[PDB]
Amino acid sequence: MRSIIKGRVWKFGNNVDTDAILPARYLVYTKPEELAQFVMTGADPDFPKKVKPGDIIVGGKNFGCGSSREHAPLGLKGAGISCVIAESFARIFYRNAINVGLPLIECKGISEKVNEGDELEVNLETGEIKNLTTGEVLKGQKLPEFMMEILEAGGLMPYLKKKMAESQL
Amino acid sequence: MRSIIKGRVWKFGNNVDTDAILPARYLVYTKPEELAQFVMTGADPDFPKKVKPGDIIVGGKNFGCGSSREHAPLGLKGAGISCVIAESFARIFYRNAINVGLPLIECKGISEKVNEGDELEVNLETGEIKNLTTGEVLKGQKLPEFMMEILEAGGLMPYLKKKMAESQL
């Protein structure tokens, strides 16, 4: 589980909905490997041609808004997106993402301080964000240790297996 | 569940271990109603005679330290402890507590700004803590909305129940 993430940024704006992230026509697919091929194609039909595993997505307010669509974060995960940093996240998208093991970070003002193509360093444990391209540094909201453990585990289900293997009732 | 908890404080010190919280001789019990009767009896054998449901526990550093003992936060929960606020918590206790629906908040310096018997108002969502009998306002670490959801569900199992009940895949 890399606590500290360095990657180049793909940028998206406000109210980017689950249709932008994973179009309805791909709901036929349930595997992350399949879904990875179609990430963000609602917003940019060529996106899967540009993105590389390890890249970071930066979004505006209310990223992932819309009704539940687990395929959306599952696809980002499958594509190797290292994390998503946004001004804010829709609530359903947010929990779905943490539970599939996709790190998310809220950072007010991120939209003003990062450009598409910039290189970022993100410390998940502290929320500190460094724009390497520009030298600017920001303070996002850290992931608490409790949530780092879920992420480190790979998501909720593998998290559960570990917790149950260690129980005693 | 309340975003805001108000309660009178019971105070304990540093490195309060799982034996202080729920002594080993009580491991024979698995129900919260039973364990409730013996909360904190390692540190204060009369504690169950004083504590009332809704009361808050304030702890020093490394509260809940020791090997995994699920009974310890289960007993606190069973006793109706509304919240535990500490300078810091042991990792294992911390996850065991959140996973049985027991709200925890970390607040550096809480030990010096609260007396036993003081009345506190704790905002779980922002982490802001008002010492009502003192007027002082302290800043604890907020529980992220993701964890608020687990607590609002009553713990990990009831959370999982609803999450699969809401699943598409």
d(CA A91, CA B145): 8
DSSP for chain B, written as a single string:
--SEEEEEEEE--TT-BHHHHS-GGGTT--SHHHHGGGTTTTT-TTHHHH--TT-EEEE-TTBTBSS--THHHHHHHHTT--EEEES-B-HHHHHHHHHTT--EEE-TTHHHH--TT-EEEEETTT-EEEETTT--EEEPPPPPHHHHHHHHHTSHHHHHHHHHHT---
Classify A80 as helix, strand or coil.
Answer: coil
Classify A41 as helix, strand or coil.
Answer: coil
Distances A1 to A50, A154, B144, B161 between C-alpha atoms, Å: 25, 9, 20, 27
d(CA B102, CA B79): 11
> Which one of A69, A146, A156, A159 makes the best mutation probe of the B interface by having the most chain B beta carbons within 10 Å?
A146
Q: Which residues of A touch B163 (CB under 8 A)?
A: 95, 99, 156
Is residue A38 left, alpha or beta, with left meaning phi > 0 and alpha meaning psi from -120 to 50? alpha
Distances A22 to A9, A38, A40, A73, A98 between C-alpha atoms, Å: 19, 6, 6, 9, 17
Classify A95 as helix, strand or coil.
Answer: helix
Q: This structure's resolution (angstroms)? A: 2.0
Side chain identity at B28, as an amino acid letter? V
Classify A104 as helix, strand or coil.
Answer: strand
Contact yes or no for A168 and B91 at CB 8 A: no
Phi, psi of A59 (to 5 degrees): -130, 165
- Which of A68, A143, A149 is facing B168, going by the closest CB pair? A68
Q: Say if CB A118 and CB A136 are below 8 A apart.
A: no
d(CA A35, CA A23): 10
Phi, psi of B44 (to 5 degrees): -145, 100
Domains of chain A: 1-169 (3.20.19.10)
CA angle A42, A83, A12 (to 5 degrees): 35
Q: Say if CB B138 and CB B107 are below 8 A apart.
A: yes
d(CA A91, CA A94): 5
Q: Say if CB A32 and CB A39 are below 8 A apart.
A: no
Q: Say if CB B35 and CB B29 are below 8 A apart.
A: yes
For B103, other C-beta atoms within 10 Å of its C-beta total 23
Shortest Cα distance, chain B CAs vs residue A126, angstroms: 12
Please enumerate in sequence order all residues whose Cβ is within 8 A of that of B25, keeping only pairs 6 or more positions apart, or say none: none
**Span between the terminal Cα atoms of chain A, in Å:** 29
Classify A123 as helix, strand or coil.
Answer: strand
Number of Cα atoms under 13 Å in the Cβ half of residue B55: 19
Q: Say if CB A86 and CB A58 are below 8 A apart.
A: yes
Q: Say if CB B113 and CB A116 are below 8 A apart.
A: no
> Which one of B31, B146, B147, B161 makes the best mutation probe of the A interface by having the most chain A beta carbons within 10 Å?
B146
Query: Which method, experimentally, gave rise to this model?
Result: X-ray
Please enumerate in sequence order all residues whose Cβ is within 8 A of that of A63, keeping only pairs 6 or more positions apart, or say none: A12, A16, A84, A86, A87, A88, A89, A90, A93
- Which of A141, A143, A168 is facing B70, going by the closest CB pair? A168
Q: Tokens 């804010």 map to which residue?
A: A88
d(CA B86, CA B136): 17
